[PDB]
């Protein structure tokens, strides 16, 4: 590798071929794995020179080398990305999207993905410079399979970064412009394209219900459910995130997920060996049991109540916390018959065992659930049977001890339970 001093000497030479050789040397330096000297290159003042080289249409090699060098600077910290933006790189890269050389257009796609991925402000600035139309034009072919794999993967990833980040979410008109192409990519047979398409959809459904509706109206829920069942963990993870986001919306949006058959995948998801999959599947279940009584009934019909008993009994604690929410939501909105069924499946003992958790929030959630189950027992006149159940498995000990607990909501609801049923 060259030294930064020699790269500077070559780039300042006013000899195009000397500049090309030095820019290639900079590219190779910035491509090394262990601590590339990004800050040294920035401090040397080379970014504006690299940006000017992006416009040298007669010398496509120096366009490519400078695009690659700038890509790897913009891959770093926000301050390093800002240095690239401050050098004028955004409109220069957008102009390169139209290059007749595929490897150069691809490098501009990559660089814009790094810039837009930095945060909402740079994302929106890339959009304001007009990046979306030429990016989408590169995908305006009747069959995506005619494009090179790596080219298509890079385009999908950059589009996904234009969809990500919040405060603010991406402009509504930009999302509307991107979504039809994103839906095509979501049906494309390549695992990396599918993964990044799912991530993009997961970003667009992470927000207010109006944003969820824009996505659900494009008809993607059945494809998301298909990808929910994929064998590749990098696909299941964003597919599950998107499905989980969608069921945080309206009852009607939640129903599209149920109608598409998503619940049939959850015996596997709720026992998945990856902790984060179990956690986010249980989170998704908790928002489905926050739904209508007919939606709770679909959870019952799919045999998922025993699986909720399972995760409550034994899982990572964060998963158990989501399971507690699923139970409290279920008992808050369920019929008496649905709550009777939950007790019959064995919920009481794992519920009580979690009252030993040194976590104030899960205790409040569990005490709420117990209260909800007692209210169902009152309508059946069987609160005595439930009190014996709670005592037999060691639950009265822990409720009683929770009267002497610090947090106010805890001992309040705790004392209430004992006065009225014990």
């Amino acid at each position: 590798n060259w030294s930064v001093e020699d790269i500077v000497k070559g780039i300042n030479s006013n000899n195009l071929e000397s500049q090309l050789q030095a820019t290639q040397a900079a590219r190779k330096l910035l491509s090394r794995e262990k601590q590339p000297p990004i800050d040294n290159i920035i401090r040397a003042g080379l970014i504006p020179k690299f940006v000017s080289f992006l416009g040298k249409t007669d010398c496509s090699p120096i366009q490519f080398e400078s695009a690659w060098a700038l890509t790897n600077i913009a891959s770093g910290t926000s301050e390093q990305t800002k240095a690239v933006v401050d050098g004028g790189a955004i409109p220069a890269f957008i102009s390169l999207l139209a290059s007749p050389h595929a490897h150069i257009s691809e490098q501009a796609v990559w660089a814009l993905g790094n810039i837009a991925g930095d945060g909402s402000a740079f994302r929106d600035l890339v959009i304001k410079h007009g990046a979306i139309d030429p990016l989408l034009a590169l995908l305006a072919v009747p069959d995506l399979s005619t494009l090179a794999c790596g080219y298509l993967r890079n385009l999908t990833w950059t589009l996904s970064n234009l969809c990500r980040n919040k405060n603010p979410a991406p402009p509504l008109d930009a999302v509307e412009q991107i979504l039809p192409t994103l839906v095509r990519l979501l049906h494309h047979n390549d695992p990396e394209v599918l993964a990044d398409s799912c991530w993009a959809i997961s970003y667009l459904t992470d927000g207010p219900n109006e944003r969820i509706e824009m996505v659900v109206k494009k008809g993607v829920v059945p494809q998301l459910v298909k990808l929910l069942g994929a064998t590749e963990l990098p696909i299941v993870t964003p597919a599950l995130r998107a499905i989980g986001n969608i069921v945080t919306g309206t009852d009607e949006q939640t129903q599209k997920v149920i109608d598409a058959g998503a619940l049939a995948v959850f015996p596997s998801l709720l026992t998945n060996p990856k902790t984060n999959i179990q956690k986010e599947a249980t989170w998704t279940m908790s928002n489905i049991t926050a739904g209508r009584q007919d939606q709770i009934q679909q959870v019952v019909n799919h045999g998922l109540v025993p699986f909720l008993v399972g995760v409550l009994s034994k899982a990572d604690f964060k998963t158990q916390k989501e399971a507690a929410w699923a139970i409290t939501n279920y008992t808050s909105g369920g019929t008496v018959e649905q709550i009777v069924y939950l007790v019959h499946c064995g919920i009481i003992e794992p519920l009580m065992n979690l009252l030993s958790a040194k976590d104030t929030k899960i205790i409040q959630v569990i005490l709420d659930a117990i209260s909800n189950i007692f209210q169902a027992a009152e309508k059946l006149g069987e609160t005595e049977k439930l009190s014996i159940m709670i005592e037999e498995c060691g639950g009265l000990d822990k409720i009683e001890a929770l009267q002497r607990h610090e947090n106010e909501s805890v001992y309040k609801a705790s004392l209430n339970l004992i006065e009225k049923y014990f």
Partner: peptide
């Protein structure tokens, strides 16, 4: 009942 709502850069080697 409560609904509960919830790299980005690549180096070219």
């Amino acid at each position: 009942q409560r609904k509960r709502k919830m790299s980005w850069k690549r180096v070219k080697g």
